[PDB]
Amino acid sequence: ELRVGNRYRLGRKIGSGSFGDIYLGTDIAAGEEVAIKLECVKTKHPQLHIESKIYKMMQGGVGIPTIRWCGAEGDYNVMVMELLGPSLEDLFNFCSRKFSLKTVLLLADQMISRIEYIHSKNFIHRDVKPDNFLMGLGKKGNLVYIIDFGLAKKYRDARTHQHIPYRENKNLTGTARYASINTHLGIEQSRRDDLESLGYVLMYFNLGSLPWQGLKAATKRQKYERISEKKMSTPIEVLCKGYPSEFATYLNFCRSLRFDDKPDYSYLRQLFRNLFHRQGFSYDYVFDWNMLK
Amino acid sequence: MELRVGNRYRLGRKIGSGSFGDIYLGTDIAAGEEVAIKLECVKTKHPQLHIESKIYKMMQGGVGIPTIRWCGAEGDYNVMVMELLGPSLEDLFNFCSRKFSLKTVLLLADQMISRIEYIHSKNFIHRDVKPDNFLMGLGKKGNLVYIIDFGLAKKYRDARTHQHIPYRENKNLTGTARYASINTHLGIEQSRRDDLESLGYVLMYFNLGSLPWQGLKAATKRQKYERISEKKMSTPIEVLCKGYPSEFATYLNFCRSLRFDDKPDYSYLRQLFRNLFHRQGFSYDYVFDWNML
Ligand SMILES: Fc1ccc2[nH]c(CNc3nc(N4CCOCC4)nc4c3ncn4-c3ccc4ccccc4c3)nc2c1F
Ligand code: NA
Ligand code: NA
């Protein structure tokens, strides 16, 4: 129970984000439902205001949620954001945990572009997973958004574009299921890692699971190591057996990138667009969830 | 002449037999409220209603836990007044001709795992997991599964330090044989794993209509329990669960594999069934079989 900024009513908690939990809220005068991220104001490692500045800078990008307000109330720093629709994990569930090839390809085009946009503004996301992509609402119902800059990092200097240096012995940031192999091996993340993670997300939608899910281990730290080991020991063409070759081509391209390379985002989009064309699918933007009755 | 305990509580019919005392429908005349009332004979050699009331009190505020009020002795009974709930899952199973649909089983499973997890989070094991001890709410709480009856419950870890109780052997079987874990039949101290194994048998009971170790007749309770034990031990999980989704066997195997002092992965177990629920095309609408009769 809180009122933020003389303007917003705080509603229920709906999930967690990076360094802050996510709540529904209401702009009381406008009657507009919003999403609200909260950070304990006494935290040793404050970052919500850093995140807010990244959002302000990213504003105007297609599929970046709008930031409505950032401030403080009571015991919290507060960031009020545009309300979006369900996540891609939610929609995957609503689609019986199967997506058509067409839907996978429609999603892939947008997800690559969203990652490219973030990179163009000098950041890497570092938390690419199905729960961080949400569909828009209303006139934006066909648009895939990416959320959460709480794990984002600047990878190149804004004035000179000098890339960050190569580093080793680093910690994993996001969900281990989708981490790149180099992230598991302790290498500093860069643009290639966001795109490799996306490749695992796409094959997760194709398969329903990844082969490194559900592994036994004594501890969380050891579980991550076993996930790493299974990823390293599963050839891409085994992972992607029976699916269009483009999914393997995509993953091998990402794994081939140098630390500081600029990815060829166009190439990666074109793989999937050419497959979409060869398959004869309609250019109607109809996703699988648009068929639900 | 109608029964009234103290001046305040009018007893109606018996609605269940609890582990150490029976539960009656009743009226709190002073409050003007329909309630449930548990009575324990004050001359019992092993008084425990007050103990049970304390466990309920400590559980208070948990989702799906009834509220209670301890009322001490009245004449030659100890009295505990309880929030009145709706029908038990056994009662509903009978109403539904002793078979539930897969969707209903999976709706129930999600909540039952969560109720057990909650009890474990408050440092107790239930030790009598059975359909008679899960009740639906009344009215607007009709979609909520509650758990009742702490008469056999035991603290399994220290509330502060989480030190677990020690392993013990040669324990008598005091709960319900039909749903007892294999280790319980073998005299082993119960722990969190046993509550979850029992729940696995409850789910397969709802799927099948009966378990293969029901109806085994014998002269004595020890002989009957031995026949049940032997049938459980000698029926492979994959035979028990033949013709049902693999998740039911995966669940039971997971529970049987846990160490005595292991913390179960309750999230994994809920996700196992939620993924199945979605693959089957069901919606979380809380429309149970008894709603569509
Ligand atoms: F009870 C529930 C359960 C799930 C629901 N999903 C939705 C769909 N809307 C949004 N959901 C989320 N969730 C993130 C945390 O896990 C839950 C989903 N973030 C949003 C949303 N709309 C905007 N954001 C949003 C916008 C900007 C962000 C910026 C940083 C971090 C998180 C951010 C989140 N409503 C739900 C609901 F009512
Ligand atoms: Na990544
Ligand atoms: Na219902």
mmCIF file with all atom_site columns, all heavy atoms in Angstrom, chain B residues 6-24:
data_model
loop_
_atom_site.group_PDB
_atom_site.id
_atom_site.type_symbol
_atom_site.label_atom_id
_atom_site.label_alt_id
_atom_site.label_comp_id
_atom_site.label_asym_id
_atom_site.label_entity_id
_atom_site.label_seq_id
_atom_site.pdbx_PDB_ins_code
_atom_site.Cartn_x
_atom_site.Cartn_y
_atom_site.Cartn_z
_atom_site.occupancy
_atom_site.B_iso_or_equiv
_atom_site.pdbx_formal_charge
_atom_site.auth_seq_id
_atom_site.auth_comp_id
_atom_site.auth_asym_id
_atom_site.auth_atom_id
_atom_site.pdbx_PDB_model_num
ATOM 1   N N   . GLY B 1 6  ? -20.311 -25.613 26.338 1.00 0.00 ? 6  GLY B N   1
ATOM 2   C CA  . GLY B 1 6  ? -20.298 -24.357 27.052 1.00 0.00 ? 6  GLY B CA  1
ATOM 3   C C   . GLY B 1 6  ? -21.660 -23.731 26.848 1.00 0.00 ? 6  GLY B C   1
ATOM 4   O O   . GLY B 1 6  ? -22.644 -24.461 26.611 1.00 0.00 ? 6  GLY B O   1
ATOM 5   N N   . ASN B 1 7  ? -21.756 -22.426 26.987 1.00 0.00 ? 7  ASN B N   1
ATOM 6   C CA  . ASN B 1 7  ? -23.006 -21.777 26.603 1.00 0.00 ? 7  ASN B CA  1
ATOM 7   C C   . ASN B 1 7  ? -23.030 -21.275 25.182 1.00 0.00 ? 7  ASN B C   1
ATOM 8   O O   . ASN B 1 7  ? -24.082 -20.920 24.663 1.00 0.00 ? 7  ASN B O   1
ATOM 9   C CB  . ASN B 1 7  ? -23.371 -20.670 27.552 1.00 0.00 ? 7  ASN B CB  1
ATOM 10  C CG  . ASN B 1 7  ? -23.370 -21.141 28.950 1.00 0.00 ? 7  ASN B CG  1
ATOM 11  O OD1 . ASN B 1 7  ? -24.064 -22.107 29.283 1.00 0.00 ? 7  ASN B OD1 1
ATOM 12  N ND2 . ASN B 1 7  ? -22.528 -20.525 29.765 1.00 0.00 ? 7  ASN B ND2 1
ATOM 13  N N   . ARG B 1 8  ? -21.927 -21.333 24.488 1.00 0.00 ? 8  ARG B N   1
ATOM 14  C CA  . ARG B 1 8  ? -21.792 -20.550 23.345 1.00 0.00 ? 8  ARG B CA  1
ATOM 15  C C   . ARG B 1 8  ? -21.932 -21.373 22.038 1.00 0.00 ? 8  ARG B C   1
ATOM 16  O O   . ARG B 1 8  ? -22.270 -20.829 20.998 1.00 0.00 ? 8  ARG B O   1
ATOM 17  C CB  . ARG B 1 8  ? -20.451 -19.835 23.489 1.00 0.00 ? 8  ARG B CB  1
ATOM 18  C CG  . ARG B 1 8  ? -20.215 -18.827 22.457 1.00 0.00 ? 8  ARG B CG  1
ATOM 19  C CD  . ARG B 1 8  ? -18.983 -18.038 22.804 1.00 0.00 ? 8  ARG B CD  1
ATOM 20  N NE  . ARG B 1 8  ? -18.586 -17.336 21.626 1.00 0.00 ? 8  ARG B NE  1
ATOM 21  C CZ  . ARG B 1 8  ? -17.507 -16.577 21.531 1.00 0.00 ? 8  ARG B CZ  1
ATOM 22  N NH1 . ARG B 1 8  ? -16.775 -16.273 22.606 1.00 0.00 ? 8  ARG B NH1 1
ATOM 23  N NH2 . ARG B 1 8  ? -17.232 -16.012 20.373 1.00 0.00 ? 8  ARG B NH2 1
ATOM 24  N N   . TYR B 1 9  ? -21.630 -22.669 22.051 1.00 0.00 ? 9  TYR B N   1
ATOM 25  C CA  . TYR B 1 9  ? -21.425 -23.429 20.812 1.00 0.00 ? 9  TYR B CA  1
ATOM 26  C C   . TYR B 1 9  ? -22.425 -24.531 20.653 1.00 0.00 ? 9  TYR B C   1
ATOM 27  O O   . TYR B 1 9  ? -22.450 -25.456 21.426 1.00 0.00 ? 9  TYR B O   1
ATOM 28  C CB  . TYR B 1 9  ? -20.011 -24.019 20.736 1.00 0.00 ? 9  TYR B CB  1
ATOM 29  C CG  . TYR B 1 9  ? -18.962 -22.968 20.920 1.00 0.00 ? 9  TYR B CG  1
ATOM 30  C CD1 . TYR B 1 9  ? -18.303 -22.810 22.131 1.00 0.00 ? 9  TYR B CD1 1
ATOM 31  C CD2 . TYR B 1 9  ? -18.716 -22.044 19.915 1.00 0.00 ? 9  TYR B CD2 1
ATOM 32  C CE1 . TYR B 1 9  ? -17.379 -21.784 22.312 1.00 0.00 ? 9  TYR B CE1 1
ATOM 33  C CE2 . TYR B 1 9  ? -17.823 -21.010 20.112 1.00 0.00 ? 9  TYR B CE2 1
ATOM 34  C CZ  . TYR B 1 9  ? -17.129 -20.912 21.286 1.00 0.00 ? 9  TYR B CZ  1
ATOM 35  O OH  . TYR B 1 9  ? -16.263 -19.854 21.533 1.00 0.00 ? 9  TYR B OH  1
ATOM 36  N N   . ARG B 1 10 ? -23.245 -24.443 19.653 1.00 0.00 ? 10 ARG B N   1
ATOM 37  C CA  . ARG B 1 10 ? -24.222 -25.448 19.396 1.00 0.00 ? 10 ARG B CA  1
ATOM 38  C C   . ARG B 1 10 ? -23.631 -26.386 18.384 1.00 0.00 ? 10 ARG B C   1
ATOM 39  O O   . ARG B 1 10 ? -23.205 -25.926 17.301 1.00 0.00 ? 10 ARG B O   1
ATOM 40  C CB  . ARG B 1 10 ? -25.485 -24.789 18.852 1.00 0.00 ? 10 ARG B CB  1
ATOM 41  C CG  . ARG B 1 10 ? -26.700 -25.664 19.020 1.00 0.00 ? 10 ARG B CG  1
ATOM 42  C CD  . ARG B 1 10 ? -27.912 -25.019 18.393 1.00 0.00 ? 10 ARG B CD  1
ATOM 43  N NE  . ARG B 1 10 ? -29.121 -25.731 18.767 1.00 0.00 ? 10 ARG B NE  1
ATOM 44  C CZ  . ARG B 1 10 ? -30.331 -25.377 18.360 1.00 0.00 ? 10 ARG B CZ  1
ATOM 45  N NH1 . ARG B 1 10 ? -30.499 -24.322 17.563 1.00 0.00 ? 10 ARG B NH1 1
ATOM 46  N NH2 . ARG B 1 10 ? -31.368 -26.098 18.721 1.00 0.00 ? 10 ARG B NH2 1
ATOM 47  N N   . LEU B 1 11 ? -23.605 -27.683 18.701 1.00 0.00 ? 11 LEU B N   1
ATOM 48  C CA  . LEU B 1 11 ? -23.084 -28.680 17.760 1.00 0.00 ? 11 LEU B CA  1
ATOM 49  C C   . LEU B 1 11 ? -24.132 -29.228 16.831 1.00 0.00 ? 11 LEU B C   1
ATOM 50  O O   . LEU B 1 11 ? -25.169 -29.704 17.264 1.00 0.00 ? 11 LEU B O   1
ATOM 51  C CB  . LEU B 1 11 ? -22.453 -29.852 18.436 1.00 0.00 ? 11 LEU B CB  1
ATOM 52  C CG  . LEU B 1 11 ? -21.306 -29.621 19.336 1.00 0.00 ? 11 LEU B CG  1
ATOM 53  C CD1 . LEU B 1 11 ? -20.726 -30.964 19.770 1.00 0.00 ? 11 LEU B CD1 1
ATOM 54  C CD2 . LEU B 1 11 ? -20.236 -28.776 18.700 1.00 0.00 ? 11 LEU B CD2 1
ATOM 55  N N   . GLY B 1 12 ? -23.815 -29.211 15.547 1.00 0.00 ? 12 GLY B N   1
ATOM 56  C CA  . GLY B 1 12 ? -24.574 -29.940 14.535 1.00 0.00 ? 12 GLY B CA  1
ATOM 57  C C   . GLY B 1 12 ? -23.868 -31.265 14.236 1.00 0.00 ? 12 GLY B C   1
ATOM 58  O O   . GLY B 1 12 ? -23.229 -31.870 15.097 1.00 0.00 ? 12 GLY B O   1
ATOM 59  N N   . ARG B 1 13 ? -23.944 -31.705 13.010 1.00 0.00 ? 13 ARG B N   1
ATOM 60  C CA  . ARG B 1 13 ? -23.428 -33.020 12.655 1.00 0.00 ? 13 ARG B CA  1
ATOM 61  C C   . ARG B 1 13 ? -21.917 -33.096 12.617 1.00 0.00 ? 13 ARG B C   1
ATOM 62  O O   . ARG B 1 13 ? -21.233 -32.102 12.431 1.00 0.00 ? 13 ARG B O   1
ATOM 63  C CB  . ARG B 1 13 ? -23.962 -33.470 11.315 1.00 0.00 ? 13 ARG B CB  1
ATOM 64  C CG  . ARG B 1 13 ? -23.566 -32.605 10.130 1.00 0.00 ? 13 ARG B CG  1
ATOM 65  C CD  . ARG B 1 13 ? -24.293 -32.982 8.840  1.00 0.00 ? 13 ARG B CD  1
ATOM 66  N NE  . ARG B 1 13 ? -23.782 -32.228 7.697  1.00 0.00 ? 13 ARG B NE  1
ATOM 67  C CZ  . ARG B 1 13 ? -22.759 -32.574 6.926  1.00 0.00 ? 13 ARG B CZ  1
ATOM 68  N NH1 . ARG B 1 13 ? -22.062 -33.705 7.133  1.00 0.00 ? 13 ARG B NH1 1
ATOM 69  N NH2 . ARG B 1 13 ? -22.392 -31.756 5.928  1.00 0.00 ? 13 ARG B NH2 1
ATOM 70  N N   . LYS B 1 14 ? -21.420 -34.307 12.791 1.00 0.00 ? 14 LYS B N   1
ATOM 71  C CA  . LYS B 1 14 ? -20.034 -34.608 12.599 1.00 0.00 ? 14 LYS B CA  1
ATOM 72  C C   . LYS B 1 14 ? -19.730 -34.498 11.120 1.00 0.00 ? 14 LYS B C   1
ATOM 73  O O   . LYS B 1 14 ? -20.494 -35.029 10.310 1.00 0.00 ? 14 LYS B O   1
ATOM 74  C CB  . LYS B 1 14 ? -19.771 -36.024 13.086 1.00 0.00 ? 14 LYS B CB  1
ATOM 75  C CG  . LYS B 1 14 ? -18.339 -36.446 12.908 1.00 0.00 ? 14 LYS B CG  1
ATOM 76  C CD  . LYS B 1 14 ? -18.105 -37.778 13.587 1.00 0.00 ? 14 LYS B CD  1
ATOM 77  C CE  . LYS B 1 14 ? -16.826 -38.409 13.081 1.00 0.00 ? 14 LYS B CE  1
ATOM 78  N NZ  . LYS B 1 14 ? -16.684 -39.766 13.665 1.00 0.00 ? 14 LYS B NZ  1
ATOM 79  N N   . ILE B 1 15 ? -18.663 -33.783 10.777 1.00 0.00 ? 15 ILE B N   1
ATOM 80  C CA  . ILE B 1 15 ? -18.244 -33.630 9.379  1.00 0.00 ? 15 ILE B CA  1
ATOM 81  C C   . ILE B 1 15 ? -16.922 -34.299 9.028  1.00 0.00 ? 15 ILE B C   1
ATOM 82  O O   . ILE B 1 15 ? -16.608 -34.472 7.847  1.00 0.00 ? 15 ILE B O   1
ATOM 83  C CB  . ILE B 1 15 ? -18.222 -32.163 8.923  1.00 0.00 ? 15 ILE B CB  1
ATOM 84  C CG1 . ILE B 1 15 ? -17.312 -31.293 9.792  1.00 0.00 ? 15 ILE B CG1 1
ATOM 85  C CG2 . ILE B 1 15 ? -19.638 -31.614 8.910  1.00 0.00 ? 15 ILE B CG2 1
ATOM 86  C CD1 . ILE B 1 15 ? -17.119 -29.905 9.201  1.00 0.00 ? 15 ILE B CD1 1
ATOM 87  N N   . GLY B 1 16 ? -16.156 -34.705 10.030 1.00 0.00 ? 16 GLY B N   1
ATOM 88  C CA  . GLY B 1 16 ? -14.973 -35.499 9.752  1.00 0.00 ? 16 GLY B CA  1
ATOM 89  C C   . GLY B 1 16 ? -14.364 -36.042 11.025 1.00 0.00 ? 16 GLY B C   1
ATOM 90  O O   . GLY B 1 16 ? -14.648 -35.561 12.132 1.00 0.00 ? 16 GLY B O   1
ATOM 91  N N   . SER B 1 17 ? -13.560 -37.089 10.873 1.00 0.00 ? 17 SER B N   1
ATOM 92  C CA  . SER B 1 17 ? -12.860 -37.657 11.992 1.00 0.00 ? 17 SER B CA  1
ATOM 93  C C   . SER B 1 17 ? -11.394 -37.289 11.756 1.00 0.00 ? 17 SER B C   1
ATOM 94  O O   . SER B 1 17 ? -10.801 -37.619 10.731 1.00 0.00 ? 17 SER B O   1
ATOM 95  C CB  . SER B 1 17 ? -13.144 -39.156 12.119 1.00 0.00 ? 17 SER B CB  1
ATOM 96  O OG  . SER B 1 17 ? -12.770 -39.840 10.948 1.00 0.00 ? 17 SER B OG  1
ATOM 97  N N   . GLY B 1 18 ? -10.839 -36.550 12.700 1.00 0.00 ? 18 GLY B N   1
ATOM 98  C CA  . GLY B 1 18 ? -9.506  -36.011 12.576 1.00 0.00 ? 18 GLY B CA  1
ATOM 99  C C   . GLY B 1 18 ? -8.625  -36.997 13.282 1.00 0.00 ? 18 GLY B C   1
ATOM 100 O O   . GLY B 1 18 ? -9.104  -37.971 13.891 1.00 0.00 ? 18 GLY B O   1
ATOM 101 N N   . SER B 1 19 ? -7.330  -36.750 13.241 1.00 0.00 ? 19 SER B N   1
ATOM 102 C CA  . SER B 1 19 ? -6.403  -37.761 13.744 1.00 0.00 ? 19 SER B CA  1
ATOM 103 C C   . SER B 1 19 ? -6.585  -38.093 15.250 1.00 0.00 ? 19 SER B C   1
ATOM 104 O O   . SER B 1 19 ? -6.335  -39.234 15.637 1.00 0.00 ? 19 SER B O   1
ATOM 105 C CB  . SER B 1 19 ? -4.943  -37.397 13.424 1.00 0.00 ? 19 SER B CB  1
ATOM 106 O OG  . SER B 1 19 ? -4.703  -36.047 13.712 1.00 0.00 ? 19 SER B OG  1
ATOM 107 N N   . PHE B 1 20 ? -7.077  -37.139 16.064 1.00 0.00 ? 20 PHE B N   1
ATOM 108 C CA  . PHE B 1 20 ? -7.187  -37.308 17.572 1.00 0.00 ? 20 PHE B CA  1
ATOM 109 C C   . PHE B 1 20 ? -8.461  -36.634 18.155 1.00 0.00 ? 20 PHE B C   1
ATOM 110 O O   . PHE B 1 20 ? -8.432  -36.016 19.243 1.00 0.00 ? 20 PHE B O   1
ATOM 111 C CB  . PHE B 1 20 ? -5.971  -36.708 18.310 1.00 0.00 ? 20 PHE B CB  1
ATOM 112 C CG  . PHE B 1 20 ? -4.691  -37.453 18.145 1.00 0.00 ? 20 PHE B CG  1
ATOM 113 C CD1 . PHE B 1 20 ? -3.912  -37.282 17.016 1.00 0.00 ? 20 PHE B CD1 1
ATOM 114 C CD2 . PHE B 1 20 ? -4.201  -38.228 19.187 1.00 0.00 ? 20 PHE B CD2 1
ATOM 115 C CE1 . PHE B 1 20 ? -2.710  -37.935 16.887 1.00 0.00 ? 20 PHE B CE1 1
ATOM 116 C CE2 . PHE B 1 20 ? -2.988  -38.882 19.078 1.00 0.00 ? 20 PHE B CE2 1
ATOM 117 C CZ  . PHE B 1 20 ? -2.242  -38.738 17.921 1.00 0.00 ? 20 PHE B CZ  1
ATOM 118 N N   . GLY B 1 21 ? -9.586  -36.757 17.479 1.00 0.00 ? 21 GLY B N   1
ATOM 119 C CA  . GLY B 1 21 ? -10.736 -35.917 17.812 1.00 0.00 ? 21 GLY B CA  1
ATOM 120 C C   . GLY B 1 21 ? -11.523 -35.737 16.549 1.00 0.00 ? 21 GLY B C   1
ATOM 121 O O   . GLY B 1 21 ? -10.981 -35.803 15.439 1.00 0.00 ? 21 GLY B O   1
ATOM 122 N N   . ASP B 1 22 ? -12.798 -35.495 16.708 1.00 0.00 ? 22 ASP B N   1
ATOM 123 C CA  . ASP B 1 22 ? -13.653 -35.286 15.568 1.00 0.00 ? 22 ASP B CA  1
ATOM 124 C C   . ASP B 1 22 ? -14.027 -33.838 15.377 1.00 0.00 ? 22 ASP B C   1
ATOM 125 O O   . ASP B 1 22 ? -13.943 -33.026 16.316 1.00 0.00 ? 22 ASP B O   1
ATOM 126 C CB  . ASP B 1 22 ? -14.879 -36.140 15.732 1.00 0.00 ? 22 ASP B CB  1
ATOM 127 C CG  . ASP B 1 22 ? -14.558 -37.620 15.709 1.00 0.00 ? 22 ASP B CG  1
ATOM 128 O OD1 . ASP B 1 22 ? -13.518 -38.010 15.103 1.00 0.00 ? 22 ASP B OD1 1
ATOM 129 O OD2 . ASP B 1 22 ? -15.328 -38.381 16.315 1.00 0.00 ? 22 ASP B OD2 1
ATOM 130 N N   . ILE B 1 23 ? -14.421 -33.523 14.139 1.00 0.00 ? 23 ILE B N   1
ATOM 131 C CA  . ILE B 1 23 ? -14.821 -32.163 13.753 1.00 0.00 ? 23 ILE B CA  1
ATOM 132 C C   . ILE B 1 23 ? -16.316 -32.164 13.484 1.00 0.00 ? 23 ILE B C   1
ATOM 133 O O   . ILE B 1 23 ? -16.817 -33.016 12.740 1.00 0.00 ? 23 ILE B O   1
ATOM 134 C CB  . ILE B 1 23 ? -14.103 -31.677 12.478 1.00 0.00 ? 23 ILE B CB  1
ATOM 135 C CG1 . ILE B 1 23 ? -12.596 -31.924 12.558 1.00 0.00 ? 23 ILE B CG1 1
ATOM 136 C CG2 . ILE B 1 23 ? -14.401 -30.222 12.186 1.00 0.00 ? 23 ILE B CG2 1
ATOM 137 C CD1 . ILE B 1 23 ? -11.947 -31.223 13.690 1.00 0.00 ? 23 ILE B CD1 1
ATOM 138 N N   . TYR B 1 24 ? -16.996 -31.167 14.052 1.00 0.00 ? 24 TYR B N   1
ATOM 139 C CA  . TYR B 1 24 ? -18.452 -31.014 13.950 1.00 0.00 ? 24 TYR B CA  1
ATOM 140 C C   . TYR B 1 24 ? -18.748 -29.676 13.314 1.00 0.00 ? 24 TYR B C   1
ATOM 141 O O   . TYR B 1 24 ? -18.031 -28.719 13.528 1.00 0.00 ? 24 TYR B O   1
ATOM 142 C CB  . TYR B 1 24 ? -19.103 -31.005 15.336 1.00 0.00 ? 24 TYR B CB  1
ATOM 143 C CG  . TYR B 1 24 ? -19.010 -32.327 15.995 1.00 0.00 ? 24 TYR B CG  1
ATOM 144 C CD1 . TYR B 1 24 ? -17.819 -32.736 16.587 1.00 0.00 ? 24 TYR B CD1 1
ATOM 145 C CD2 . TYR B 1 24 ? -20.094 -33.206 15.976 1.00 0.00 ? 24 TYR B CD2 1
ATOM 146 C CE1 . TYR B 1 24 ? -17.692 -34.007 17.145 1.00 0.00 ? 24 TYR B CE1 1
ATOM 147 C CE2 . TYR B 1 24 ? -19.989 -34.462 16.543 1.00 0.00 ? 24 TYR B CE2 1
ATOM 148 C CZ  . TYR B 1 24 ? -18.782 -34.859 17.114 1.00 0.00 ? 24 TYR B CZ  1
ATOM 149 O OH  . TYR B 1 24 ? -18.661 -36.103 17.678 1.00 0.00 ? 24 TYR B OH  1
#
